[PDB]
Curated annotation (Swiss-Prot):
Protein name stated in the entry: E3 ubiquitin-protein ligase Mdm2
Protein location: Nucleus, Nucleoplasm; Cytoplasm; Nucleus, Nucleolus; Nucleus
Record-annotated SWIB/MDM2 domain positions: 2-85
Record's function text: E3 ubiquitin-protein ligase that mediates ubiquitination of p53/TP53, leading to its degradation by the proteasome.
Residues of the full protein shown: 21 to 105 of 473
Protein family according to the UniProt entry: Belongs to the MDM2/MDM4 family.
Length: 85
């Protein structure tokens, strides 16, 4: 029931992926980032479950060359870096 507010940088990525508003449930943020990841071809299905983002804006906001989509605690933390409230 908590609505979070992406920073301007993260918000721009979400909107490029099709997001329409300025605040979101965490589930919505994860959904739009999933769409962003697929749009930028950072993830290949049925391989190692790795997001490869070293050359993408996402890599900087998160701070990585890659991460596993199974590392959910880490992903929540990397998203949290990019929230206002
Ligand atoms: C990269 C794809 C697959 C397009 C989306 C990812 N699929 C979700 C996922 O967990 N995929 C997955 C795929 C395959 C297997 C397997 N074969 O064992 C296990 C897990 C993952 C996720 C869901 C819910 C909470 C979190 Cl924190 C999360 F990271 C997932 C998601 O739903 N959104 C999201 C956003 C970021 Cl930044 C990063 C990641 C996502």
């Amino acid at each position: 029931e908590k609505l979070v507010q992406p920073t301007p940088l993260l918000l721009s990525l979400l909107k490029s992926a099709g997001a329409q508003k300025e605040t979101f449930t965490m589930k919505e943020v994860l959904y739009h980032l999933g769409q962003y990841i697929m749009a930028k071809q950072l993830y290949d299905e049925k391989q190692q479950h790795i997001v490869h983002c070293s050359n993408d804006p996402l890599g900087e906001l998160f701070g990585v060359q890659e991460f596993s989509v199974k590392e959910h605690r880490r992903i929540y933390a990397m998203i949290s870096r990019n929230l206002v409230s």
